[PDB]
Design a protein around this ligand. Structure first.
Ligand SMILES: CCCCCCCCCCCCCCCCCC(=O)OC[C@H](COP(=O)([O-])OCC[N+](C)(C)C)OC(=O)CCCCCCCCCCCCCCCCC
Ligand SMILES: CCCCCCCCCCCCCCCCCC(=O)OC[C@H](COP(=O)([O-])OCC[N+](C)(C)C)OC(=O)CCCCCCCCCCCCCCCCC
Ligand SMILES: CCCCCCCCCCCCCCCCCC(=O)OC[C@H](COP(=O)(O)OCCN)OC(=O)CCCCCCCCCCCCCCCCC
Ligand SMILES: NC(=O)C1=CN([C@@H]2O[C@H](COP(=O)(O)OP(=O)(O)OC[C@H]3O[C@@H](n4cnc5c(N)ncnc54)[C@H](OP(=O)(O)O)[C@@H]3O)[C@@H](O)[C@H]2O)C=CC1
Ligand code: SF4
Ligand code: SF4
Ligand code: SF4
Lengths: 158, 320, 115, 388, 210, 176, 84
């Protein structure tokens, strides 16, 4: 057969992307209420595992961090610690108003006004709390975001 | 000025500084620090990036909401440069490779791209243009890296005469490729490749001082049109420097790797540069003229090398 | 009236005693802290900061205000000794990210309206 | 002090209660000292409430014990109503008991299943959250929100039950005792579960009262105390149910008490569905409760009261009250001080989990490290209310 | 109990019983009790001099006609106009008699308050909360230290003069590779509303003119 | 009225003692626990096939915000600022002025969707049904800036979702 | 073993190390607070040096008195029971 380098890189990129989105093992900070809706996303009706998303993942095997609740100033150092220990590729999902931008404690002295002040965020899931279905939509949006990555294709043209 | 670009606030995260900067090469070692400092004071940073969006994620926390904007660009496509500098007041250029690749050689990263970024910046109305060069840049140097730095520095000074050209020495820091080079390449799998290390004198500068120097060149109105030389407090002997690095990393030092695809780690030209001697050009202004005090290597070398250290230290000897 | 219940000290001499003791515990601690927390400062910079914190509260003469200042300083020590703090809390004393803030009239005049 | 193990649940697991930093001294397998550090979900809620009208402050109470949303609302509403000197209408009192017991079921499923999940018994967790998911639909149909309903308000409830809700609640309640029975077929007589809960974290009756415990933590030790029976507050004097009482004061009796409370909640829910009376849902007094949207667009007085109620808010007479209810976790109470304006002067929240967690060190003495997981679970700690 | 659908009924027998017990406590501990009042919604409060805490709390716990075995809560209120700005409130519960009682005292920034842990072990964490949020020091407390605020947090947030958003905010800095505190700057300032109506609402609470 | 959850006295006849001995040695209750789990394996799963199947909602559901219009096409909002005053999270920012035809209309209407708690107090307080919470719950974004809605966005949401919003109001306005 | 003159050798050795103290003005009797001009804080730093040097703890009550080196040497002697 005959094939260019550009074609080979495009197909290998699709393979690794398909594997990375098909097997997303999430770490979940269950900081507050939004953790309860994260638990409903694992329960029978939605069953995130059927997408390949394991119920429980350790911090140092995790692929995505889900920040489900209010990030207080006392807790912020610990969350950045966990984020650094995560091996790459690593993605953060910000779930709910509190994590997205402080929410209903935005004007508090003890609350970080959004977790994007601490860690980079890939997807923002609105709600207080987002419904289990709304979080599931967010995770499926992360899978499509990963599908569009072009790591190998960029590397070839460097 | 314009009512939008009038500084407000107290210089913090949510404040306004009036700096609207396009930083090319923002995703490198020097870029991450410049974007960080521009974003502490509430600047509007446009980040043209060639890489994946994933590789830029570290820059996003560095600004308030809306302050960091990302764009695609290609050094060969000029119209992608124009879209990046059209609304900017200062255009900082940090583009470079320590090594050649198939697509970009040293004469394309350092001459053709910087000249294109400088020309479009002129034609787009941009006012301030920061261009980075090398202290040891020389037309007659063997290291091709530095000879390209010499010509490219010559074309910027013609395309954009009011441009501030900054010439640093080897820069050291957490993510540098200077002290991290002496700790790793020399140690693991190898014994130092030092080529007559007693004949080389080095004057390295801390990253933050270079970052501070670049910012003040934006805020200082006399910097326009002037070439600068950023050098550390001390001159070191390349042999002693490597020795000192090893003591910090607790790796034993005993006086006495092919380039490849991916990312050449150790290369033919890199050695030629680590051995070039830090030129002294007294007439050029330095960090002293921008309000920055050069920081000692000793203070900010345990910071850099604490990672290499496995699981009571004496300094190096300076050369007057 | 001036008849007030005491916290610990019944006059400044006792209060200055506890102040003196608390400085001993902090002076000994900095060498340990700079190691356990893997700080990038020298033990000299750390001990200067402890001197600076104690100096700022020099004028105080009320025995009760001094008791509370000591009580708070010990709670700070208890957190650092027992390693309840983290590397970030210990380094907050040094304000290493806040840029230089001027203090001369012309400098404040150029930047903003703050007095 | 053989060794100090600073155990941070920072890298949290599937519990969702919050995050707890636990500092312990382990003289071998045994625990000699336990020291919970609890600032991690402190959000300044009590101070923020001072800048909000009484209506604006109500959603804060959904987000305290965020598995007892409508029970926290009722406590706030009973406190405010007491200062206002008004009375909610009889239909709303039945709706507030009805959804108070649907909330008790919601809380105990989380309490028992996540307690068992931490001790390795994962399956009942999935069995029962299919039921909580059906209960979340009742919340959403009356309020529009699955969790933070904001439905129980001073004066009554925001809206009336939509047509067809009571039938669906009855259908859920009809099949629910079997769901509890399946749960006991996996835990009640299971020797592994009993070995993990029997004679763990024993609390004496005398130490329970002095340490401030309430709810199951008292009744496990044999104290006959339930606020719904001794200090009734809505229509709880008009519904028959029994209080489960423990005999040994250990985790296993506390586990049994909660499982029996779920059965008594279904008993109560049955009576509420049959005795639901007709009428209005909020106090018919428009200087407290907003008028109907039809009247506000027709009547001058209604538009004025609507305009002022949603801007200034109703003013509450000066005074201070301590109101407590039998929340699922324990006695939930608010100490509310009114300065006479439309914003509370001080709102102190009494969380049952605050005292229980402070009593952890007492209970953990002379137990292995793996027991502490069982002790915290049987306390039913959520850090939304521990910290506020 | 009257046919007024929207008005909370009065229980007068409870009001009488609580007033009788208010005198009883005042008669027995005259050294300490400064005031006794029963509200319209039937809640007895005993105001005491700060020195009578332990004698007053002990008597209510142990007396055969008090038996307030349970400390339901313990908190402070900040009223800056008062000279003793802090008011310490004890809510107690009696299960033998199915009754509640409130005990209140006061202090200032520089007056310690005796710890009640000797009387109610429940007060251990309550007083740590009072110290942390209000800066009221309790003497003879087994372990007084912050319980809610972050380590190294300067100030006492629940004081009326502490600003809502505080003075410092946290972010992550790439350059120093840690979470750094900095002076607070809000992108949108909290908007203060003036909601009080200029017309009196409750004549029964009118205060006499100056 | 109370009951004893665990106050049994185990019988001490030989027949009962042998029953507990058989249980202890033959693992009877443990087998029974295995039976219940086996029964669930043959029960039908409660999972639904998201996104092809969706969980049931009601007309009262509180989702994304939108600004509505009258049938003629004029905006319902009259800039009374009752929603801004009630908003518990201070998520709404309003500015107004007289329009070119003298009408009382907003020039700025913003909702910080990251401040909002989706409580629906603003729709309860609006006198003209101008601000509503729609039925959309699938609008998660990749950047924070995409969740700060200005007037155009909320007007576009009203134009986008009016068909459904109007029907939901029709279904619930009598309860309101 | 004791060497009363040995004590004075070390005390002057320690004080010579303290950066604030200028060697020249130092004397066996020079006053810390007046001749040398140190602050009360600095006097506490010096005492801590002597605890390390002579392997015992100098209490606070005693520390305030030791206001010049001659006093230190005398105090050091008494606790060590040097009778020379
Ligand atoms: C190339 C071999 C190198 C060695 C690799 C490691 C060992 C060998 C393993 C081979 C992997 C075999 C599994 C391939 C999976 C194919 C994806 C798939 O299942 O389709 C469903 C998916 C379904 O799409 P979806 O993921 O978006 O589904 C969304 C969910 N639904 C549909 C329910 C809404 O189809 C795809 O999208 C294609 C993904 C890209 C597949 C790229 C891999 C194909 C092989 C290319 C090799 C190139 C070599 C150079 C020539
Ligand atoms: C042991 C067996 C286990 C089972 C099989 C395991 C899976 C095997 C199938 C997967 C193989 C995938 C290999 C690629 C690895 C992932 C690459 C990636 O993520 O991108 C990061 C990098 C992207 O490069 P980069 O340099 O841009 O990334 C770093 C970016 N900076 C510099 C900013 C930090 O990808 C690679 O390095 C690719 C390495 C070479 C891959 C092979 C290419 C050969 C084909 C092209 C030549 C054709 C010539 C004709
Ligand atoms: C898998 C299928 C499980 C069947 C359903 C569960 C079941 O039927 O077991 C119940 C039965 C009675 O057990 P129990 O309720 O405790 O009362 C017994 C009085 N001694 O329990 C039993 O009788 C089960 C006894 C099984 C025999 C012991 C196992 C031997 C294993 C080697 C074969
Ligand atoms: N650090 C030092 O020791 C010294 C550095 N300098 C100058 O400092 C500048 C930056 O320093 P450093 O940050 O260390 O360099 P880096 O290599 O660390 O980063 C360089 C940047 O240039 C970008 N870049 C490289 N090649 C291309 C290309 N062909 N097209 C587009 N973008 C490109 C990279 O983006 P991507 O990663 O996306 O490819 C990267 O962000 C360079 O110009 C260098 O010459 C001068 C003297 C000393
Ligand atoms: S966003 Fe809402 S539900 Fe989530 S933690 Fe915050 S208040 Fe609770
Ligand atoms: S739903 Fe509630 S929090 Fe959100 S904008 Fe409306 S009133 Fe404000
Ligand atoms: S949306 Fe409604 S409540 Fe808000 S300003 Fe407009 S008309 Fe008034």
């Amino acid at each position: 057969p005959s094939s260019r380098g550009e074609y080979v890189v495009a197909k290998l990129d699709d393979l690794i992307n398909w594997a990375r989105r098909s097997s997303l093992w999430p770490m979940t900070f269950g900081l507050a209420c939004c953790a309860v809706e994260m638990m409903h996303m694992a329960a029978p009706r939605y069953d995130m595992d059927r997408f390949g998303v394991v119920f429980r993942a350790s911090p140092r095997q995790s692929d995505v961090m889900i920040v489900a609740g209010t990030l207080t100033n006392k807790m912020a150092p610990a969350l950045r610690k966990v984020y650094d220990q995560m091996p790459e590729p690593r993605y953060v999902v910000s779930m709910g108003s509190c994590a997205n931008g402080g929410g209903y404690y935005h004007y508090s002295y003890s609350v970080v006004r959004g977790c994007d002040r601490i860690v980079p965020v890939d997807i923002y899931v609105p709600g207080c709390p987002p419904t289990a279905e709304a979080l599931l939509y967010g995770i499926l949006q992360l899978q499509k975001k990963i599908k569009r990555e072009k790591r190998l294709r960029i590397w070839y043209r460097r | 000025l314009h009512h939008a670009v009038i500084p407000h606030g107290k210089g913090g995260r949510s404040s306004v500084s009036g700096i609207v900067a396009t930083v090319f090469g923002a995703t490198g070692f020097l870029g991450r620090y410049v974007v960080n400092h521009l974003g502490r004071m509430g600047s509007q940073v446009i980040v043209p990036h060639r890489c994946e969006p994933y590789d830029t994620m570290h820059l996003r926390p560095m600004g308030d909401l809306g302050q960091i904007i990302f764009m695609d660009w290609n050094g060969r496509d000029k119209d992608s440069i124009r879209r990046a500098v059209e609304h900017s007041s200062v255009v900082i250029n940090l583009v470079g490779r320590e090594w050649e690749t198939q697509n970009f050689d040293f004469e394309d990263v350092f001459v053709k791209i910087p000249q294109a970024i400088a020309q479009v910046s002129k034609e787009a109305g941009v006012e301030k243009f920061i261009h980075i060069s090398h202290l040891n840049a020389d037309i007659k140097s063997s290291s091709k890296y530095l000879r390209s730095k010499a010509v490219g520095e010559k074309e910027v000074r013609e395309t954009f005469p009011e441009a501030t050209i900054i010439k640093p020495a080897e820069i050291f820091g957490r993510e540098d490729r200077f002290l991290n080079y002496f700790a790793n390449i020399r140690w693991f799998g190898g014994v130092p490749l030092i080529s007559l290390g007693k004949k080389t004198v080095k004057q390295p500068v801390y990253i933050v001082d270079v970052t501070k120097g670049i910012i003040n060149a934006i805020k200082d109105p006399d910097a326009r049109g002037k070439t600068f030389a950023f050098v550390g407090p001390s001159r070191y002997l390349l042999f002693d420097l490597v020795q000192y690095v090893f003591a910090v990393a607790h790796r034993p030092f005993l006086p006495y790797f092919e380039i490849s695809p991916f990312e050449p780690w150790t290369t033919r030209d890199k050695v030629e540069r680590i051995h070039t001697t830090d030129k002294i050009l007294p007439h050029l202004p330095g960090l002293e003229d921008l309000g920055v005090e050069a920081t000692p290597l000793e203070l900010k070398a345990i910071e850099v090398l604490r990672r290499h250290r496995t699981y009571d230290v004496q300094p190096a000897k300076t050369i007057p | 009236s001036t008849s007030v219940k005491p916290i610990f000290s019944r006059d400044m001499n006792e209060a200055k005693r506890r102040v003196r003791e608390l400085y001993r515990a902090w002076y000994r601690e900095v060498p340990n802290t700079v190691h356990l927390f893997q700080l990038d400062i020298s033990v000299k910079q750390g001990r200067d900061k402890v001197r600076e914190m104690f100096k700022k509260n020099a004028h105080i003469t009320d025995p009760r205000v001094v008791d509370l200042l000591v009580i708070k300083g010990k709670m700070e020590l208890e957190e650092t000794i027992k390693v309840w703090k983290q590397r970030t809390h210990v380094m907050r004393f040094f304000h290493e990210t806040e840029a230089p803030r001027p203090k001369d009239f012309l400098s404040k005049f150029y930047v903003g309206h703050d007095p | 002090l053989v060794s100090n193990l600073t155990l941070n649940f920072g890298p949290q697991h599937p519990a969702a209660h919050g995050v707890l930093r636990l500092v312990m001294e382990l003289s071998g397998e045994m625990v000699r000292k336990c020291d919970p550090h609890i600032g991690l979900l402190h959000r300044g809620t009590e101070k923020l409430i001072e800048y909000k009208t009484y209506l604006q402050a109500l959603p804060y109470f959904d987000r305290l014990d965020y598995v007892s949303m409508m029970c926290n609302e009722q406590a706030y509403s009973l406190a405010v109503e007491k200062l206002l000197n008004i009375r909610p209408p009889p239909r709303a009192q039945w709706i507030r008991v009805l959804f108070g017991e649907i909330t008790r079921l919601l809380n105990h499923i989380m309490a028992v299943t996540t307690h068992a999940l931490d001790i390795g018994a994962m399956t009942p967790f999935f069995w029962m959250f299919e039921e909580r998911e059906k209960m979340f639909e009742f919340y959403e149909r009356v309020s529009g929100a699955r969790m933070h309903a904001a439905y129980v308000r001073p004066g009554g409830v925001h809206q009336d039950l939509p047509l067809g809700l009571m039938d669906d609640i009855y259908e859920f309640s009809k099949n629910f005792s079997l769901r509890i029975d399946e749960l006991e077929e996996m835990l009640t007589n299971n020797r592994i579960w009993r070995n993990r809960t029997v004679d763990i974290g024993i609390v004496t009756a005398e130490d329970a009262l002095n340490y401030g415990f309430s709810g199951v933590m008292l009744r496990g030790s044999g104290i006959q105390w339930d606020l719904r029976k001794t200090q009734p507050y809505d229509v709880y004097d008009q519904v028959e149910f029994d209080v489960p009482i423990g005999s040994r004061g250990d985790c296993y009796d506390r586990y049994l008490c909660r499982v029996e409370e779920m059965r008594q909640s279904i008993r109560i829910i049955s009576q509420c569905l049959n005795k639901m009376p007709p009428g209005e849902i909020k106090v018919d007094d428009a200087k407290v409760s907003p008028p109907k949207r039809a009247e506000m667009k027709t009547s001058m007085e209604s538009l004025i009261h609507h305009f002022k109620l949603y801007t200034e808010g109703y003013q509450v007479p000066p005074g201070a009250t301590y109101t407590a209810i039998e929340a699922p976790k324990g006695e939930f109470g608010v100490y509310l001080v009114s300065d006479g304006s439309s914003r509370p002067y001080r709102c102190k929240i009494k969380a049952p989990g605050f005292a229980h967690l402070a009593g952890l060190d007492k209970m953990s003495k002379g137990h292995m490290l793996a027991d502490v997981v069982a002790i915290i679970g049987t306390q039913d700690i959520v850090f939304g209310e521990v910290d506020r | 109990a009257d046919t007024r659908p929207t008005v909370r009924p009065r229980n007068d027998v409870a009001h009488k019983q609580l007033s009788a017990f208010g005198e009883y406590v005042a008669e027995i501990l005259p050294k300490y009790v400064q005031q006794v009042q029963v509200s319209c919604f039937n809640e007895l409060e005993i105001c005491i001099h700060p020195d009578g805490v332990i004698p007053v709390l002990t008597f209510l716990r142990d007396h055969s006609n008090a038996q307030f075995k349970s400390l339901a809560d313990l908190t402070a209120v900040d009223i800056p106009t008062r000279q003793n700005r802090f008011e310490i409130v004890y809510n107690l519960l009696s299960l033998r008699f199915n009754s509640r009682i409130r005990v209140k005292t006061y202090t200032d920034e520089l007056t310690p308050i005796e710890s009640s842990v000797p009387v109610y072990k429940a007060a251990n964490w309550y007083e740590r909360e009072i110290w942390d949020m209000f800066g009221v020091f309790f003497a003879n407390h087994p372990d007084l230290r912050r319980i809610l605020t972050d380590y190294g947090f300067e100030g006492h947030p629940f004081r009326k003069d502490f600003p809502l958003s505080g003075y410092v905010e946290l972010r992550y800095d790439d350059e120093v590779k840690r979470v750094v505190a900095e002076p607070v700057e809000l992108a949108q300032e909290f908007r203060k509303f003036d909601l009080n109506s200029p017309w009196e609402a409750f004549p029964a609470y009118r205060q006499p003119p100056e | 009225t109370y009951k004893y959850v665990n106050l049994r006295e185990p019988s001490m006849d030989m027949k009962s003692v042998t029953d507990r001995a058989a249980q202890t040695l033959l693992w009877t209750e443990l087998i029974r626990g295995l039976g219940m789990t086996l029964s669930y394996l043959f029960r039908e799963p409660a999972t639904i096939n998201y996104p092809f199947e969706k969980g049931p909602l009601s007309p009262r559901f509180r989702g994304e915000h939108a600004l509505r219009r009258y049938p003629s096409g004029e905006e319902r909002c009259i800039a009374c600022k009752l929603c801004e005053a009630v908003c518990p999270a201070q998520a709404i920012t309003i500015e107004a002025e007289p329009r070119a035809d003298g009408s009382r209309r907003t020039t700025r209407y913003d909702i910080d969707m990251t401040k909002c708690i989706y409580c629906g107090f603003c729709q309860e307080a609006c006198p003209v049904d101008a601000i509503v919470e729609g039925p959309n719950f699938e609008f998660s974004t990749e950047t924070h800036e995409e969740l700060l809605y200005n007037k155009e966005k909320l007007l576009n949401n009203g134009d986008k979702w009016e068909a459904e919003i109007a029907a939901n109001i029709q279904a619930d306005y009598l309860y309101r | 073993p004791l060497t009363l003159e040995g004590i004075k050798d070390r005390v002057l050795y320690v004080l010579k190390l303290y950066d604030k103290i200028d060697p020249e003005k130092l004397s066996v009797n020079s006053h810390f607070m007046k001749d040398l001009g140190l602050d009360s804080l600095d006097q506490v730093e010096i005492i801590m040096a002597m605890e390390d040097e002579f392997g015992f703890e100098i209490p606070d009550i005693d520390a305030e008195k030791l206001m010049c080196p001659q006093e230190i040497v005398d105090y050091i002697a008494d606790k060590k029971d040097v009778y020379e």
